Curated annotation (Swiss-Prot):
Part of the 30S ribosomal subunit. Contacts protein S4. It comes from Pyrococcus furiosus (strain ATCC 43587 / DSM 3638 / JCM 8422 / Vc1). This is Small ribosomal subunit protein uS5. Belongs to the universal ribosomal protein uS5 family. It comes from the Archaea. Keywords: Ribonucleoprotein, Ribosomal protein, RNA-binding, rRNA-binding. The N-terminal domain interacts with the head of the 30S subunit; the C-terminal domain interacts with the body and contacts protein S4. The interaction surface between S4 and S5 is involved in control of translational fidelity. One of its GO terms (biological process) is translation. Gene3D superfamilies: 3.30.160.20, 3.30.230.10. GO terms for cellular component: cytosolic small ribosomal subunit. PROSITE patterns: RIBOSOMAL_S5 (PS00585), S5_DSRBD (PS50881).
Length: 228
RNA sequence: AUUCCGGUUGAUCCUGCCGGAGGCCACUGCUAUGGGGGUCCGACUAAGCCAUGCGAGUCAAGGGGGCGUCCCUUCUGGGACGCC
């Protein structure tokens, strides 16, 4: 309910700037599932804040990396902060963002804003040989994701088995909603940005695999939010 | 738990190895209140060398004898009873 009044207040205070913003403010769009899979552009965070207001919860916002960066000038060293952050709701919507600033706080606000703009939609299910239930507690099937030199393979796992994946990967998966998965990684996983983006791509690729209608019943495939 | 993290740069991304983090076995510093179960305790170097004690005996219903007790007939000798 609190997030519902937050959405109401931001809707009252918000003036549209883009076509999608005007559409949402008018009311043609009322569910977050209606902004994806249409080719629209999301350049205004108010849409996310209104349709999926729970992403603003501190428990639902996570910062994955803070990196000091330096560039040389004849007058010395100019120092910048790069903050990699992840946001989303624990029901099938997640997003990852990178923000640059002169201070950690500025970088954090920019990164969270970009993550909100970059939010995506994923599909969950169960496809593990040892589990064979119909609940959306894991990834429906094995998926791949590559960024830089980091390759991440996510495999379904039985219920009760936690996230067998690096810390940042399990943080991203927890934000997305997944809670049981096995991992297989190659490359330099110590590069936090590349690893997080690889996990993001692996989660995103769940929509790039053709499935017959029977597979939905077999694996309990749920797109975006579930029975909630 | 089908996992990672630290380290080449003014800063970035790679390859590559080194180190942390787990289990098991052998020595070892500090320390120690109990009870049960087990197939643990001079294998790693010397299958090197050994004081002393013990670790393979049993059969009297296979045989002839010696010792001692008794019942004795009675110099003879018969029979039981054990021990050597
Ligand atoms: Zn399952």
């Amino acid at each position: 309910q609190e997030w519902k009044e937050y959405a109401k207040r931001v809707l009252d205070e918000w003036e549209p700037k883009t076509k999608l913003g005007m559409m949402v403010k008018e009311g043609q769009i009322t569910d977050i599932h209606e902004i994806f899979r249409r080719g629209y552009q999301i350049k205004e965070p108010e849409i996310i804040d209104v349709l999926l207001p729970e992403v603003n919860a501190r428990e639902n916002q996570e910062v994955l990396d803070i990196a000091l960066t330096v560039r040389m000038t004849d007058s010395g060293r100019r120092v910048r902060f790069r903050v990699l952050a992840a946001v989303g709701n624990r029901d099938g919507y997640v997003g990852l963002g990178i923000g640059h600033g002169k201070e950690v706080g500025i970088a954090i606000r920019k990164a969270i804003n970009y993550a909100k703009l970059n939010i995506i939609e994923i599909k969950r299910g169960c496809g593990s040989w040892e589990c064979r239930c119909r609940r959306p507690h894991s990834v429906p099937f094995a998926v791949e994701g590559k960024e830089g030199s980091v390759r991440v393979r996510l495999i379904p796992g039985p219920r009760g088995l936690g996230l067998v994946i690096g810390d940042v990967g399990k943080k991203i998966l927890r934000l997305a909603g997944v809670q049981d998965v096995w991992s297989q990684t190659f490359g330099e996983t110590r590069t936090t940005v590349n690893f997080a983006k690889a996990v993001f791509n692996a989660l995103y690729n769940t929509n790039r695999v053709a499935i017959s209608p029977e597979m939905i019943e077999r694996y309990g495939i749920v797109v975006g939010r579930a029975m909630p």
